[PDB]
Design an enzyme around this catalytic site. Structure first.
Site, PDB file in Angstrom:
ATOM      1  N   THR A 155     142.899  12.446  70.137  1.00 34.59           N
ATOM      2  CA  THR A 155     143.836  13.242  70.215  1.00 34.59           C
ATOM      3  C   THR A 155     143.495  14.748  70.433  1.00 34.59           C
ATOM      4  O   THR A 155     144.194  15.514  70.726  1.00 34.59           O
ATOM      5  CB  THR A 155     144.997  13.292  69.046  1.00 34.59           C
ATOM      6  OG1 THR A 155     144.276  13.757  67.850  1.00 34.59           O
ATOM      7  CG2 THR A 155     145.254  11.818  68.859  1.00 34.59           C
ATOM      8  N   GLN A 182     144.265  17.303  73.346  1.00 36.88           N
ATOM      9  CA  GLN A 182     145.168  16.235  74.209  1.00 36.88           C
ATOM     10  C   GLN A 182     146.617  16.361  74.319  1.00 36.88           C
ATOM     11  O   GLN A 182     147.760  15.772  73.987  1.00 36.88           O
ATOM     12  CB  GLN A 182     144.982  14.681  73.784  1.00 36.88           C
ATOM     13  CG  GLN A 182     144.898  13.749  74.802  1.00 36.88           C
ATOM     14  CD  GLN A 182     143.941  14.011  76.100  1.00 36.88           C
ATOM     15  OE1 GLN A 182     144.247  13.544  77.173  1.00 36.88           O
ATOM     16  NE2 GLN A 182     143.090  14.827  75.792  1.00 36.88           N
ATOM     17  N   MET A 183     146.855  17.804  74.677  1.00 39.16           N
ATOM     18  CA  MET A 183     148.546  18.052  74.529  1.00 39.16           C
ATOM     19  C   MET A 183     148.862  17.825  73.197  1.00 39.16           C
ATOM     20  O   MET A 183     150.162  17.964  73.149  1.00 39.16           O
ATOM     21  CB  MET A 183     148.957  17.386  75.796  1.00 39.16           C
ATOM     22  CG  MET A 183     149.930  18.098  76.429  1.00 39.16           C
ATOM     23  SD  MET A 183     149.756  18.048  78.125  1.00 39.16           S
ATOM     24  CE  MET A 183     149.862  19.872  78.731  1.00 39.16           C
ATOM     25  N   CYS A 184     148.127  17.730  72.333  1.00 36.87           N
ATOM     26  CA  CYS A 184     148.753  17.570  71.006  1.00 36.87           C
ATOM     27  C   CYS A 184     148.661  18.903  70.162  1.00 36.87           C
ATOM     28  O   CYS A 184     147.713  19.534  69.502  1.00 36.87           O
ATOM     29  CB  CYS A 184     147.503  16.678  70.045  1.00 36.87           C
ATOM     30  SG  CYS A 184     147.926  15.683  68.563  1.00 36.87           S
ATOM     31  N   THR A 185     149.961  19.468  70.226  1.00 34.11           N
ATOM     32  CA  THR A 185     150.006  20.672  69.524  1.00 34.11           C
ATOM     33  C   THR A 185     150.488  20.470  67.987  1.00 34.11           C
ATOM     34  O   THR A 185     150.119  21.263  66.920  1.00 34.11           O
ATOM     35  CB  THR A 185     151.272  21.816  70.153  1.00 34.11           C
ATOM     36  OG1 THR A 185     150.472  22.023  71.461  1.00 34.11           O
ATOM     37  CG2 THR A 185     151.397  22.878  69.348  1.00 34.11           C
TER      38      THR A 185
END
Ligand code: ZN
Ligand code: ZN
Ligand code: ZN
Ligand code: ZN
Lengths: 582, 582
Positions: free
Chosen positions: A479, A482-485
């Site tokens: 993650t 991976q655009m995982c904010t």
């Protein structure tokens, strides 16, 4: 043996901060009566005249002299227009005063003494303009005075000294027919012929210029008295006796009295008390001392200036951008620029550390800058709403997006260190290249549910040299960036601080023959994991076919430019042909 | 075969959110004209009458019906006083309406149809009270109607259907001498004897109650007409023909028309649209989803409720307290209490992450709480200005300091997890004990120029079991928890987040036969170092002669109480006798 009487300035001014403060309090809530307490005993060998002390108390009615002090009435004329102050007849004004003194002097010779202050207060800049004026009139102007010394009479002097000490309201005394000190009386002096003055000058053999005032009155009261005895009484050892005679070199009244400024010229005196009274400056002071003090007691070899003077550029005012800009500030960094295209959303404030519920909906980037300035007003915080195009993403509105490209260079340029704080891998490309092509230092922060990655490029590899996460890796591992904010909150906190602490260690001179500075190591990559509370430092060499820093790639961007980017952005496979992964 | 005509409610109301919004916009900027477009074709098998749709458009003049829709004029009476609404003559009001309808019905039978809405809007709570009323008058009240079925006439029905479709403004039609459908005409019906009505009811064999309205007009126009033919035309298959005759059971006009609320009773309808329109609630929503979404996609086994429902108590609103309260919030924690005795200083905002230059001078603790509420309004943030006495420190003002002791218990008590975020070792004692004696979980955060220490006590040792730093240790090492608040900024950031991430891992159920949960480990102590970017986890057993958790000590506090503390605080050596280090 003979000579003409010369004078010295009656007083020296000393305006205490309290004076100017009171002055201000009144401007926020004409002519103003003042009152000072002269101390003609406490006079420094170093000075030439009685010091005039003005404080916030001078304004008040209930002052409280101490034994032997001489109360002196005065006034202040304040102006709101700085021009009015400047454009005033300095000469006429003092002359209008001298006339009032003269009016009272002919009623009570002991009342022709006073001081005046003209001023203009710039409350916002804490600048204060003022001029002290002591009305000293000579009438007639033609009449001068020839004088000859007379062997001291410590007997007479002391006599007069005690008298003036006691009679704190009198400036002049004389002798009666029994040779005793008495108050000034025109008909009595006309005969006794001895006039004694309370001198406020220390100038050897040079009386205060206030002498001219009394002599003007004396002349008016005794037109005939042409010869007499003048006693300049000083509250010390300089008291001297003089053999006076009134001359006349060709009613004209000349007036002097303005105080010479610090430089010695005859103009206003200006004082800037911002460093003392400006909360905003006193604030800026402490922020400074915290570090100077920190350095001093624990790490004298720390270079603070470098850090302070670095112009940081933060790409992304999201969760990372906030905590980072937060840590930078606390290190002294004064130039920070936020670059974020979005706006503040309801679910942001609790995570992104620089926003409130009230600023939801508003443009994010420009608001973060605004937020730093509330924390610390002097900060040079700037917000730019620009968009960073992603790799493998159908170019949309090529024109405007192009500008966003040119505008992003202008920025990666005018700055010293670039912070790459975006969501995905795809949004790190364009900026990383631009920053390499611009010879700037780039620090990267990537977020993962459990982990994070911080690294630098100033040859060491860049983000895009080798992959970070492998496919055969953990779920909670992959993650990463991976655009995982939205992750375990603490991730962004650590990722941020380490990213800043790395920038500060890396900003310090390295000890020759070693990879460290006064602040510790300067790793290439830092990797953290929350489930186990651990950190790892890894280093990786520049890769030959990297799609970002590879010679072929840099070449391409150099040769073609935007045409290359545009093409690369829409077609990633293209970059791989150029790099050589194919 | 015969029977008496029964009715059904003319309409069913449907007020769309847009209606209520418009309603509000107008209250922030009497009687109001409305207009709906009935669609008598699109009627669900499931309903009993034509649905009345009201939206923000009903308020407007320029509505735009579609072919076959019947425009219906209506109105709304809004009230500002909720009491006025409640205390209104529901009966009289509908009756005052029915009178207006009757007035127009005798002028144009096709105008005695209308609807009305009474309402009260609670804009702050987003609650809306309203009641739909359809004026249905029966005059005279004595006159009823006996009816007998008549075999369908799909020919006649269809004829009438087309007519009403076309004539969207007419509600009644009749037959002329040529047996053709024409507008209602008193003298013509008097002879033709057939009246056709546009029914808004689907109720099998039960016409809309608006029928009573027309019949009232018919009677008034043709007193003699006692027998006739009634056609209830529906835009579907239910159209039925009836053999009418006017009876009379003993001008009296009864009026019905109020709509039954959701529950079926004859009272107002209330709707609470806060969950939809309350930004503050829509805000609270997102903060929630962020975690539910996070859990769902990456860690379904995460217990969020526990964390959310923990009442955290933060001792110290300084640098650590801010970043910690910051990370907690972002995890969902809604109950946080700040305990700090000081005020915000000029050099604080840049370091302590919950303050602005503007709040300098103000009481710190109560301001941090205020600051969390700006970020997230629903937060239960509280600030208490209390002082934690230090070990080896001359008791000052015993009384008041005693209260501070009792008051500190009341707090370490009403809370679930205690965060110890103070400057020195000396200020961790009293609270650590109180928290142990109270069976509460304590997490500690200590700062050092380079390092930090985070740990817990819920048997494992406490902070005071064994020393942390040794004397023969590094300079930059021995600054740990040594009144050293101003350190390399990043220290407090990491120390904080790790301290929170530990509390969240420790708050999750542990896998039997192991020291871990769904979130990772649950170390006893975590130690970090910046110069090398490292972390260490150490565990330490409770010590027998610890001056804080030792059996003898706990005993002492239990037995004597404050007398023990007071003595211990002023004389540390004393504690060592009790513990047994002596
Ligand atoms: Zn006289
Ligand atoms: Zn590379
Ligand atoms: Zn007619
Ligand atoms: Zn212990």
């Amino acid at each position: 043996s003979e000579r003409v009487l010369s004078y010295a300035p009656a007083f020296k001014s000393f305006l205490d901060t309290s004076f100017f403060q009171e002055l201000s309090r009144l401007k926020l809530d004409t002519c103003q009566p003042l009152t000072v307490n002269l101390d003609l005993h406490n006079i420094p060998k170093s000075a030439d005249q009685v010091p005039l002390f003005l404080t916030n108390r001078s304004f008040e009615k209930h002052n409280n002299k101490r034994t032997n002090e001489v109360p002196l009435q005065g006034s202040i004329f304040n102006f709101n227009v700085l021009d009015e102050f400047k454009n005033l007849d300095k000469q006429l004004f003092l002359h209008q005063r001298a006339l009032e003194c003269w009016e009272d002097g002919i009623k009570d010779i002991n009342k022709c003494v006073s001081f005046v202050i003209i001023s203009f207060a710039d409350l916002k800049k804490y600048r204060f303009y003022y001029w002290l004026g002591v009305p000293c009139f000579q009438r007639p102007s033609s009449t001068v005075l020839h004088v000859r010394p007379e062997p001291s009479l410590k007997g007479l002097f002391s006599k007069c000294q005690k008298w003036f000490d006691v009679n704190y309201s009198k400036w002049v005394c004389i002798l009666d027919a029994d040779d005793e000190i008495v108050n000034y009386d025109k008909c009595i002096i006309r005969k006794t012929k001895v006039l004694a003055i309370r001198d406020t000058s220390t100038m050897e053999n040079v009386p205060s210029a206030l002498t001219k005032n009394f002599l003007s009155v004396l002349q008016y009261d005794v037109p005939d008295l042409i010869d007499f005895k003048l006693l300049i009484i000083r509250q010390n050892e300089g008291s001297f006796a003089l053999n006076a005679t009134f001359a006349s070199i060709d009613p004209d009244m000349k007036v002097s009295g303005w105080e010479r400024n610090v430089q010695g010229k005859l103009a206003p005196r200006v004082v800037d008390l911002s460093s003392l009274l400006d909360p905003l400056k006193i604030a800026d002071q402490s922020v400074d001392l915290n570090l100077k003090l920190m350095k001093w007691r624990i790490l004298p070899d720390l270079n603070l200036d470098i850090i302070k003077n670095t112009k940081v550029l933060l790409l992304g005012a999201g969760t990372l951008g906030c905590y980072v800009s937060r840590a930078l500030i606390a290190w002294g960094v004064r130039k920070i620029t936020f670059v974020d295209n979005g706006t503040v959303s309801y679910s942001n404030p609790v995570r992104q550390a620089l926003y409130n519920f009230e600023d939801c909906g508003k443009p994010k980037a420009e608001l973060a800058a605004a937020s730093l300035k509330r924390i610390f007003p002097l900060m040079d915080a700037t917000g730019v709403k620009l968009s960073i195009p992603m790799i493998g993403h159908k170019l949309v509105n090529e024109e405007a997006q192009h500008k966003d490209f040119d505008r992003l260079r202008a920025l990666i340029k005018e700055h010293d260190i670039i912070f790459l704080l975006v969501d995905s891998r795809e949004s790190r490309w364009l900026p990383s290249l631009l920053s390499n092509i611009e010879n700037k230092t780039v620090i990267n922060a990537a977020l993962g549910f459990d982990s994070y990655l911080v690294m630098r490029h100033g040859q060491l590899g860049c983000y895009f040299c080798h992959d970070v996460v492998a496919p055969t890796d953990s779920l909670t591992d992959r993650t990463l960036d991976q655009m995982c904010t939205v992750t375990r909150p603490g991730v962004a906190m650590m990722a941020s601080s380490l990213a800043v602490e790395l920038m500060t260690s890396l900003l310090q001179t390295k000890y020759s023959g070693s990879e460290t500075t006064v602040l510790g190591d300067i790793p290439h990559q830092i990797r953290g994991f929350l489930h186990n509370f651990s950190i790892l430092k890894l280093e990786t060499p520049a890769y030959e076919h990297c799609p970002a820093c590879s010679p072929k790639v840099i070449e391409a961007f150099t040769d073609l430019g935007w045409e290359f980017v545009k093409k690369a952005l829409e077609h990633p496979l293209y970059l791989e042909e150029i790099s050589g992964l194919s």
